[PDB]
Each structure stands twice: as structure tokens, then as C-alpha cells.
Amino acid sequence: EFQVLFVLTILTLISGTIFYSTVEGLRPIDALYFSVVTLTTVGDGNFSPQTDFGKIFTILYIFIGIGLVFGFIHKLAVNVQLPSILSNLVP
Amino acid sequence: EFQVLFVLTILTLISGTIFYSTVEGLRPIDALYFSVVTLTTVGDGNFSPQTDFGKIFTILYIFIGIGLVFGFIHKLAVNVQLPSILSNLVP
Amino acid sequence: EFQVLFVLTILTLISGTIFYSTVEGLRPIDALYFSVVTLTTVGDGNFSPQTDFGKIFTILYIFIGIGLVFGFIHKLAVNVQLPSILSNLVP
Amino acid sequence: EFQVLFVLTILTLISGTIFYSTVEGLRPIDALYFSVVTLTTVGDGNFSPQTDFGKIFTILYIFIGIGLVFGFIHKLAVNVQLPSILSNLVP
Ligand SMILES: [Ca+2]
Ligand SMILES: [Cs+]
Ligand code: NA
Ligand code: NA
Incomplete structure (x- = not known):
């Protein structure tokens, strides 16, 4: 259970990391950070996607x-x- | 169930898209983006409504x-x- | 139930509106907006309290x-x- | 229960306060504020960590x-x- 959810979360985050670093041109670590704060709903106070894609x-x-x-x-x-x-x- | 919730979410988002593009003057896609991050509580780090309305x-x-x-x-x-x-x- | 929760939410938001408009100097409507997005965890992408208080x-x-x-x-x-x-x- | 969760939350927040004030160079109170809005998912509209660490x-x-x-x-x-x-x- 925890293992499957772990893998599924990793894949989801990998997907976001690749997307944002490619389409929005973010450094991989920044793409991962944005993916993480976005999905946990924390949000980022500085970056918002700039392209319609x-x-x-x-x-x-x-x-x-x-x-x-x-x-x-x-x-x-x-x-x-x-x-x-x-x-x-x-005790 | 999922269908009804799907339609209800769509209508809600359509409403926001129309409101923000009209009152706040956002491009339709931006109005939809703001409606989405606002309702999922992700929030947007760059835009905040500028009018009291x-x-x-x-x-x-x-x-x-x-x-x-x-x-x-x-x-x-x-x-x-x-x-x-x-x-x-x-398996 | 819904009535009590309604009143309790109103009082809580009134409290925030008063605090932020006084200590952070926000226009009442902005103080209320900040109180609302903060408590629903949506957050605001432009304002962060400036005083330690x-x-x-x-x-x-x-x-x-x-x-x-x-x-x-x-x-x-x-x-x-x-x-x-x-x-x-x-039907 | 509430006591244990209280202590655990305090320790977690203390950890964040120390980390951000040291690595990101935030004033202790700001480090605590960021730790709090981050973990409650409220987020901060002005600050995002600047270092990869x-x-x-x-x-x-x-x-x-x-x-x-x-x-x-x-x-x-x-x-x-x-x-x-x-x-x-x-009554
Ligand atoms: Ca911002
Ligand atoms: Cs948020
Ligand atoms: Na946010
Ligand atoms: Na949230």
C-alpha cells in the first residue's frame, strides 16, 4: 500500500519535473519544487506558469x-x- | 455521481472564468487558471483580485x-x- | 449546527478584519480578503504580514x-x- | 493525545525555524512564519526558498x-x- 502510493507519487512528481523544466524552462530542482508545492496545495508565492501549455x-x-x-x-x-x-x- | 460532480465542477469553473475575465480583465485561460488554483486552495503567487467586486x-x-x-x-x-x-x- | 458554525465563522472573520486593518493597515475589505484566503489555506500571492505582531x-x-x-x-x-x-x- | 500532538508540532516547527533562519538566512520569526504557512498549506505569497538545500x-x-x-x-x-x-x- 504505502509502497505503491510511494511509487505512484514519485512517478507523478517525475512527470511534473520533466514538464516544467521543458515547457516552462525551470531548473529541474525548481520544476520538482513547483510540482510538490502545487500538488500539496501549499502553492508557490513567486512562480506561476507563463505559457498557456x-x-x-x-x-x-x-x-x-x-x-x-x-x-x-x-x-x-x-x-x-x-x-x-x-x-x-x-511505558 | 462522478458525472454529476464533474458537470457541477465544470459549471462552477465556467462561472469563475467568465467573472474574472470580465471584472478583473483576465485572459480567459488565466481566469480559468485562477479559478482552479483558488478552489483547490493551491492559490496563485502572482495574481490577487484588484477590484472590490x-x-x-x-x-x-x-x-x-x-x-x-x-x-x-x-x-x-x-x-x-x-x-x-x-x-x-x-497478479 | 450550520447556523452556529455560520456565526462562529463570521466572528472569526470579523476578528481578522479588525486586526489586519488596524495592525497591518489594510483597507477593511482587504483585511477580510486576507483573513478568508488565509483560513481556507488558499493564501494570497501578494500580501504577507509586515509586522511581527x-x-x-x-x-x-x-x-x-x-x-x-x-x-x-x-x-x-x-x-x-x-x-x-x-x-x-x-426524476 | 492533544498534548503529544502539541509537542510534536512544536518540535517540527522549531526544526523549521532553525533550518530557515540558518540556511535561508531568515529572521527567526520569519522562519517560523514560513514553516507554519508551509505546513498548513496556506503558503507565503512573497518568500520561496532561494537555495537548493x-x-x-x-x-x-x-x-x-x-x-x-x-x-x-x-x-x-x-x-x-x-x-x-x-x-x-x-441551555
Ligand atoms: Ca508573489
Ligand atoms: Cs495555498
Ligand atoms: Na498559496
Ligand atoms: Na490547502
Whole structure:
């Protein structure tokens, strides 16, 4: 479960990294940063896609990607962090 | 269900596209982009409505639109992407 | 329920409107806009509190206000919009 | 529960405050503000990490921190504010 969601998130982020570095001309690390803050809905206070292609892709990327990204964040903290902490509270 | 939520989201976004392109003078594609990042709470790092009408509308648009948009994103990934992936994990 | 959450949200937003217009010197409508996008996590791409008082308040305002605001948005679409639409789907 | 989540959130925010004030050179209060709006997904409309180290950390900070921060906000309003209000509605 967590593994599959992990891989799916990675692929999704790889896709965004490639798209933004190519179409919007961002440095790979910046493309990844934008993909990440966009899908987690944090957003970026400085960059907004400048091309129409970038805008359309971002719209679609958002609708398809948020569900997944949060599904992963959900399991990451519940099935991977909840116990590691919950078990530690055990005297 | 997914169909109704799909149509409802489209209508909501069409409404925003028309409003922002008319009152805030945004190019239609930019009006749609702003409507989308606003309702998914991603936000835009460059544009904020400049008119009081735009500000009041955005406030109302947000309260009425987020519930719907996330209800659609929820079903989109759960009733349309969960299986297409879950079924594929089947050896 | 919806009424109480409605009033609670109004009071919370009134509080923010007063704070930002006074401490950060924003026009009342802008103070309200910032309070709204902040609590719904949409965020504003142009304004960030400039005073330390504004920053500390925003931090506290966020932790105390998001839970409420989303509790209201949740009931607004589920107990006030779900039926008005769900009932309409009835042939 | 609320106590543990409280402490965990504090530690997480302390970590961000230290990181951003050191690597991105932000005033401690600004580092804390950025950590807070980032983890609650509100985002900041003016600042984005400028160093690659800052970008990578923010990406990881987000994935590890949102789950926790919202788990705390969830219990804060449900197990600490819901009653204080719900009980008051009692004639
Ligand atoms: Ca900006
Ligand atoms: Cs945001
Ligand atoms: Na934002
Ligand atoms: Na958000």
C-alpha cells in the first residue's frame, strides 16, 4: 500500500519535473519544487506558469495529482508514523 | 455521481472564468487558471483580485466552491483511479 | 449546527478584519480578503504580514481558525448543498 | 493525545525555524512564519526558498509535516474546541 502510493507519487512528481523544466524552462530542482508545492496545495508565492501549455497542464496535473499525493501523505503519517510514535508512548 | 460532480465542477469553473475575465480583465485561460488554483486552495503567487467586486466574489466563490471541487477530486481518485490501479495490482 | 458554525465563522472573520486593518493597515475589505484566503489555506500571492505582531497573530489565527472554517465549509456543502442538488436529481 | 500532538508540532516547527533562519538566512520569526504557512498549506505569497538545500528540505519538510500539523489542528478543534462550544449551546 504505502509502497505503491510511494511509487505512484514519485512517478507523478517525475512527470511534473520533466514538464516544467521543458515547457516552462525551470531548473529541474525548481520544476520538482513547483510540482510538490502545487500538488500539496501549499502553492508557490513567486512562480506561476507563463505559457498557456503550462497553465492547462497545471490545471489537469492538479485535479489528477492532489488525490494521490494526499492519499500518500495520509498513509505515510498513519501507517508509518502513527505507530513509530504510538508504540513509543508505551511505558 | 462522478458525472454529476464533474458537470457541477465544470459549471462552477465556467462561472469563475467568465467573472474574472470580465471584472478583473483576465485572459480567459488565466481566469480559468485562477479559478482552479483558488478552489483547490493551491492559490496563485502572482495574481490577487484588484477590484472590490473581485475580492467579494472570490470570498463567496471560495466558500461555495471548495466543498464541491474537493468532493469531485475525492470521487475522481477513489471511484475512478483507485480501482484502475487497485485492479492492476492483481497478479 | 450550520447556523452556529455560520456565526462562529463570521466572528472569526470579523476578528481578522479588525486586526489586519488596524495592525497591518489594510483597507477593511482587504483585511477580510486576507483573513478568508488565509483560513481556507488558499493564501494570497501578494500580501504577507509586515509586522511581527501581524506574523504572530497570523500563526495563531491559522491554528485556531482553519478547523472551524473547514467544519463550516464541510456542513455548508453537505447539509445545505448536497440535498438541494441530490433532491433535484430525483426524476 | 492533544498534548503529544502539541509537542510534536512544536518540535517540527522549531526544526523549521532553525533550518530557515540558518540556511535561508531568515529572521527567526520569519522562519517560523514560513514553516507554519508551509505546513498548513496556506503558503507565503512573497518568500520561496532561494537555495537548493532550502528547496529539498522544504519538499521533505512538507511530506513529513502536513500529516502531523493537520492531525493536531483536527484534535485541537474537535477535542478542545468542539466541547467548549458544544457544551455552551446547552441551555
Ligand atoms: Ca508573489
Ligand atoms: Cs495555498
Ligand atoms: Na498559496
Ligand atoms: Na490547502
